Write an enzyme that holds these catalytic residues in place. Structure first.
Site, mmCIF file in Angstrom:
data_model
loop_
_atom_site.group_PDB
_atom_site.id
_atom_site.type_symbol
_atom_site.label_atom_id
_atom_site.label_comp_id
_atom_site.label_asym_id
_atom_site.label_seq_id
_atom_site.Cartn_x
_atom_site.Cartn_y
_atom_site.Cartn_z
ATOM 1 N N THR A 12 0.886 -1.144 0.000
ATOM 2 C CA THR A 12 0.000 0.000 0.000
ATOM 3 C C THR A 12 0.928 1.198 0.000
ATOM 4 O O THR A 12 1.870 1.253 0.775
ATOM 5 C CB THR A 12 -0.963 -0.108 1.209
ATOM 6 O OG1 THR A 12 -2.173 -0.769 0.793
ATOM 7 C CG2 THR A 12 -1.309 1.223 1.782
ATOM 8 N N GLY A 17 8.870 6.016 -2.848
ATOM 9 C CA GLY A 17 9.720 5.876 -1.665
ATOM 10 C C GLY A 17 9.867 4.478 -1.108
ATOM 11 O O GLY A 17 10.366 3.577 -1.774
ATOM 12 N N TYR A 150 0.415 13.619 13.135
ATOM 13 C CA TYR A 150 1.168 12.567 12.458
ATOM 14 C C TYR A 150 1.803 11.603 13.444
ATOM 15 O O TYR A 150 1.639 10.396 13.314
ATOM 16 C CB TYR A 150 2.253 13.192 11.596
ATOM 17 C CG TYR A 150 3.185 12.192 10.982
ATOM 18 C CD1 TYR A 150 2.832 11.516 9.812
ATOM 19 C CD2 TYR A 150 4.417 11.922 11.557
ATOM 20 C CE1 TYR A 150 3.698 10.597 9.228
ATOM 21 C CE2 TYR A 150 5.292 11.015 10.983
ATOM 22 C CZ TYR A 150 4.933 10.349 9.823
ATOM 23 O OH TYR A 150 5.805 9.457 9.250
HETATM 24 N N1 LIG Z 1 11.225 9.347 5.476
HETATM 25 C C1 LIG Z 1 10.834 9.381 6.766
HETATM 26 O O1 LIG Z 1 11.461 10.119 7.571
HETATM 27 C C2 LIG Z 1 9.684 8.465 7.246
HETATM 28 C C3 LIG Z 1 9.681 8.119 8.598
HETATM 29 C C4 LIG Z 1 8.728 7.286 9.135
HETATM 30 C C5 LIG Z 1 7.753 6.777 8.332
HETATM 31 N N2 LIG Z 1 7.722 7.086 7.033
HETATM 32 C C6 LIG Z 1 6.593 6.443 6.320
HETATM 33 O O2 LIG Z 1 6.875 5.766 5.072
HETATM 34 C C7 LIG Z 1 5.629 5.679 4.338
HETATM 35 C C8 LIG Z 1 5.706 5.912 2.793
HETATM 36 O O3 LIG Z 1 6.979 6.202 2.174
HETATM 37 P P1 LIG Z 1 7.541 7.709 2.282
HETATM 38 O O4 LIG Z 1 6.538 8.411 3.157
HETATM 39 O O5 LIG Z 1 9.005 7.767 2.649
HETATM 40 O O6 LIG Z 1 7.539 8.308 0.771
HETATM 41 P P2 LIG Z 1 6.323 8.877 -0.150
HETATM 42 O O7 LIG Z 1 6.864 8.922 -1.557
HETATM 43 O O8 LIG Z 1 5.695 10.139 0.362
HETATM 44 O O9 LIG Z 1 5.324 7.637 0.051
HETATM 45 C C9 LIG Z 1 3.969 7.820 0.432
HETATM 46 C C10 LIG Z 1 3.226 6.660 -0.169
HETATM 47 O O10 LIG Z 1 1.949 6.629 0.453
HETATM 48 C C11 LIG Z 1 0.989 6.702 -0.603
HETATM 49 N N3 LIG Z 1 -0.328 7.256 -0.196
HETATM 50 C C12 LIG Z 1 -0.613 8.421 0.439
HETATM 51 N N4 LIG Z 1 -1.967 8.561 0.630
HETATM 52 C C13 LIG Z 1 -2.547 7.471 0.106
HETATM 53 C C14 LIG Z 1 -3.918 6.985 -0.055
HETATM 54 N N5 LIG Z 1 -4.955 7.706 0.408
HETATM 55 N N6 LIG Z 1 -4.091 5.794 -0.668
HETATM 56 C C15 LIG Z 1 -3.062 5.055 -1.147
HETATM 57 N N7 LIG Z 1 -1.776 5.441 -1.041
HETATM 58 C C16 LIG Z 1 -1.472 6.616 -0.436
HETATM 59 C C17 LIG Z 1 1.663 7.493 -1.725
HETATM 60 O O11 LIG Z 1 1.065 7.341 -3.025
HETATM 61 P P3 LIG Z 1 -0.121 8.292 -3.609
HETATM 62 O O12 LIG Z 1 0.065 9.664 -2.969
HETATM 63 O O13 LIG Z 1 0.246 8.218 -5.061
HETATM 64 O O14 LIG Z 1 -1.463 7.623 -3.336
HETATM 65 C C18 LIG Z 1 3.068 6.929 -1.665
HETATM 66 O O15 LIG Z 1 3.244 5.729 -2.429
HETATM 67 C C19 LIG Z 1 4.645 6.646 5.045
HETATM 68 O O16 LIG Z 1 3.620 5.957 5.784
HETATM 69 C C20 LIG Z 1 5.514 7.452 5.989
HETATM 70 O O17 LIG Z 1 4.831 7.890 7.159
HETATM 71 C C21 LIG Z 1 8.647 7.916 6.459
#
Ligand SMILES: NC(=O)c1ccc[n+]([C@@H]2O[C@H](COP(=O)([O-])OP(=O)(O)OC[C@H]3O[C@@H](n4cnc5c(N)ncnc54)[C@H](OP(=O)(O)O)[C@@H]3O)[C@@H](O)[C@H]2O)c1
Ligand SMILES: NC(=O)c1ccc[n+]([C@@H]2O[C@H](COP(=O)([O-])OP(=O)(O)OC[C@H]3O[C@@H](n4cnc5c(N)ncnc54)[C@H](OP(=O)(O)O)[C@@H]3O)[C@@H](O)[C@H]2O)c1
Ligand SMILES: NC(=O)c1ccc[n+]([C@@H]2O[C@H](COP(=O)([O-])OP(=O)(O)OC[C@H]3O[C@@H](n4cnc5c(N)ncnc54)[C@H](OP(=O)(O)O)[C@@H]3O)[C@@H](O)[C@H]2O)c1
Ligand SMILES: NC(=O)c1ccc[n+]([C@@H]2O[C@H](COP(=O)([O-])OP(=O)(O)OC[C@H]3O[C@@H](n4cnc5c(N)ncnc54)[C@H](OP(=O)(O)O)[C@@H]3O)[C@@H](O)[C@H]2O)c1
Lengths: 248, 249, 247, 248
Positions: A12, A17, A150
């Site tokens: 999902t 990322g 968040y």
């Molecule tokens: N880098 C950090 O510091 C960090 C730390 C802790 C956790 N995270 C977690 O890692 C996860 C995702 O990777 P990222 O955040 O690093 O990169 P990102 O590129 O922002 O990934 C976010 C992903 O979540 C999807 N998404 C958002 N809303 C959605 C919805 N309503 N339905 C389906 N998909 C949805 C996005 O795709 P679409 O927008 O295309 O739908 C995308 O594939 C998140 O849960 C984030 O909280 C990141």
């Protein structure tokens, strides 16, 4: 030797990322992967970038009908689910004074509500012996400026792993939370300036013992561990992949 | 596929249970393994059971001279250390009223003191990029009858991982603690006298653990393999519970 | 009010810093206090500074005979123990490469071994309903340069609270750990006094509340765990660190 | 005598159980107390049961207008707030398969959303030096059958204490979470038969080292600690008042 040979996985937020890196390594390990996300464009590019045993589905996790449709597609094609990676998420920075009901709802719909229901509707398809994985965040165990909703959402995600460990032990399914630290993804960029987006990387690198932001491929792997049978006696945990940030 | 191809690993308490299973999987993954322990007999049998790229060394971790000798042998043969698994340990069940200075010393010498010095003396041989692993225990985060000193020792082991994460980050070395739950090893057998009442202890910990079963040593080996491998390349200072959910409720 | 009216308390390391402040507030609250420590001079000065319902005993917690003697004195005088505050402790900063067997022993004898036996030998005197308190440290949940043995010792102290919660629940005794952050005591000084203020400035910068704690503020938190206000609180780790560990 | 002499306190969910006991002990300690809740009947009875320096206000924490009105009343009467006890809460037991969007919303509106906004709108009235207190639950650190949303909500409440510790340190305000274990209140009765409500007590007493369910007066006191100056160097914590339940 492929550590997920013939396992079917559902990811999902798999068009960017963390999800995408996890999709690659998963495929590399011989799985079938459904990458889920909202943006049509980025889903196709991801599906191309992977090149093998992937199908890309458009679905908003905040929508029950999109999820029902997702899991229908999953049964047509691969029938059951070995590994689920509830990894959709997003952040808006707002302090306590700035919090609006809409901001609260936006944050909690995708991060918690969406998550909850993606695991609920996967249940009939999950194979006993399956592994579920929830993405929370070091934010869940910290007090960061303007991360109010968040962080709280992510703290709630980790709690769901404990609960689901109890509720689903009767089907030998493992539910685990992964809590990334600072992983180099578009999530850092999208919170205006790209000069002040490097301020945010420099800060989290300074903070982390290992002195660097994590790579998405390094989160993929940790998620791969919890996905694999190497983590066969690991349930209900919170795996920090944060270079030591929360560990002092 | 060999996830530790040509990496040299040193396993303390590698002639039995967790260390041995971890030695197998390590070798299986293409490493060179030094299994360390006190008993000559069990060291050889382990070295046989593994069958390749292992050398067995006799050494008591409570003895500085045995450790100095260990790392001399390592320097002759494989020269450097990619992965260290401080996994020597033992338990004596005694409640607070029963605790004697000797019992306290016995417990803390092997579990903490020994551990501390095995990591100290490995330091010159550790490759930058190396991974160290400490075996604590779910006992470290619980209040169990008669586990007073053992639990406290294990709690101290986990603390050393935090500290060593800070002290050794400058050499890109990761230090991590693994906390097993109830893994099927000789450690359950050797506390109690009866083997009827050793199964009472397994039935109790299986009842307690969501997954409803005692862990296999091969399942700990694997978790340790994760922390050993590059799959855990952005994982430092953690406490990995491999306990079937026991401490996670 | 007097929240410890007529309760007898025993405080280990009560001639300085945290123990002394806790001794004052305890007496203030109407308890009888035994302050324990090694230095004769500082014991008497403490006993003077408090002025009432205190007796000062000389005892090294690393010595079984000193502890046996302590609890004999306690029996003669006040007979039983309502509150125990295992608060003796010390730190030597040494990194992993610097750690010697002696340094390891010195650290663990007072901080853990000593602690263990002070609670063991108090056991016959503890009233059911009693409260025990162990002083660990934020160090127990952190990775600080050169705190190797101290942090590990303190992490072990916290573990003893969990265990003793189980072992003594049958006598309705509560065992709790308090984990101070940066409290202004002689422990900072004794590890230059220019570079001792560097250490305070650093820990104040780190702590949300932006300041080093006062000993009186630890005393009070220990007073909570001592009192009946913490009647339904067992086995915990109470951080009194201005938020330091929370982030 | 009087550890809260002349301090003004606001207690959310103060017409029952924990809030009420905390209201009594607070008044006993010389404070002025606003007890907040939905039921008119129980608010008045509580206000009577206390007998002094209390005013009872009707307000639903899920309603922004009820909160605005609350803090207007507070301004008229006592002008500022020394101590805030965000203690409104409720549970519905439902497993993962049973979770409906409504159940999710009901649970999270009071427990988290409501909580968030009661602290937001108190902000202008809070005196620097003030103490805020959030009621989470041992549930926050456990995996209990059918506590999915409640536990996750409570886990989120605890996270808000960390964040608000950072965001409000500049005004010397302490935010702390209290996590009760099994306290003898109407919350045990109203989930389930009264034969099978007294089991639920026998089960949690069996589980807790101290071998008994907690008294509300024992939570009040712990909250009184965090409210008082005795906890003047205590910020951002999670205080377990559970008889040892989560401390193993
Ligand atoms: N880098 C950090 O510091 C960090 C730390 C802790 C956790 N995270 C977690 O890692 C996860 C995702 O990777 P990222 O955040 O690093 O990169 P990102 O590129 O922002 O990934 C976010 C992903 O979540 C999807 N998404 C958002 N809303 C959605 C919805 N309503 N339905 C389906 N998909 C949805 C996005 O795709 P679409 O927008 O295309 O739908 C995308 O594939 C998140 O849960 C984030 O909280 C990141
Ligand atoms: N089994 C569990 O569920 C569990 C749970 C938590 C933690 N642990 C930890 O697991 C580790 C051991 O594996 P095990 O208990 O499963 O099997 P075990 O047979 O008890 O393993 C103990 C190992 O440590 C060695 N050892 C003990 N004292 C030593 C010394 N002074 N010098 C060198 N080696 C020494 C033993 O061999 P010698 O007799 O030859 O020295 C043996 O190889 C310990 O660290 C233990 O505390 C196990
Ligand atoms: N300040 C901090 O940042 C901080 C943080 C966390 C925990 N703590 C803990 O708080 C406790 C005490 O207060 P403090 O250290 O800040 O002030 P301190 O003035 O250094 O207090 C140490 C106390 O321990 C006593 N002590 C040491 N060894 C002893 C022995 N063998 N027998 C009897 N007493 C002994 C000292 O007295 P004698 O020298 O006369 O024996 C003194 O009364 C220690 O356990 C320390 O670990 C402090
Ligand atoms: N008992 C336990 O084991 C336990 C454990 C952990 C946490 N807690 C927490 O303790 C707190 C409450 O005390 P209690 O649960 O022991 O007994 P309770 O009688 O259930 O208390 C609930 C209180 O919250 C109020 N409330 C509920 N929904 C509300 C809303 N929408 N707006 C305003 N007020 C509302 C209730 O008043 P009205 O019904 O009149 O609105 C009542 O005053 C809750 O936060 C609960 O989650 C209890």
């Amino acid at each position: 030797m492929y550590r997920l040979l013939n396992k079917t996985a559902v990811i999902t937020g798999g068009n960017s990322g963390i999800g995408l890196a996890t999709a690659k390594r998963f495929v590399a390990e011989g799985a079938y992967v459904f990458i889920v996300g909202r943006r049509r464009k980025e889903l196709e590019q991801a599906a191309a970038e992977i090149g093998r045993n992937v199908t890309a589905v458009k679905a908003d996790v905040t929508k029950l009908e999109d999820l029902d449709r997702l899991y229908a597609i999953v049964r047509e094609q691969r029938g059951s689910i070995d590994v689920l990676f509830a990894n959709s998420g997003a952040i808006e920075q707002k302090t306590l004074e700035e919090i609006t009901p809409e901001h609260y709802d936006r944050t909690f719909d995708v991060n918690v509500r969406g998550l909850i229901f993606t695991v609920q509707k996967a249940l009939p398809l999950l194979r006993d012996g399956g592994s579920v994985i929830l993405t929370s965040s070091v934010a869940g165990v910290l007090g960061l400026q303007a991360h109010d909703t968040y962080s709280a959402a992510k703290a709630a995600v980790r709690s769901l792993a404990r609960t689901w460990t109890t509720e689903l032990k009767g089907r030998s399914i493992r539910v685990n939370a992964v809590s990334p630290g600072a992983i180099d993804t578009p999530i850092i960029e999208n919170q205006s300036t790209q000069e002040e987006a490097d301020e945010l990387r420099a800060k989290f690198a300074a903070a982390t013992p290992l002195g660097r932001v994590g790579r998405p491929e390094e989160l993929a792997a940790a998620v791969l561990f919890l996905a694999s049978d190497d983590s066969s006696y690991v349930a209900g945990i919170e795996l920090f992949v944060d270079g030591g940030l929360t560990q002092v």
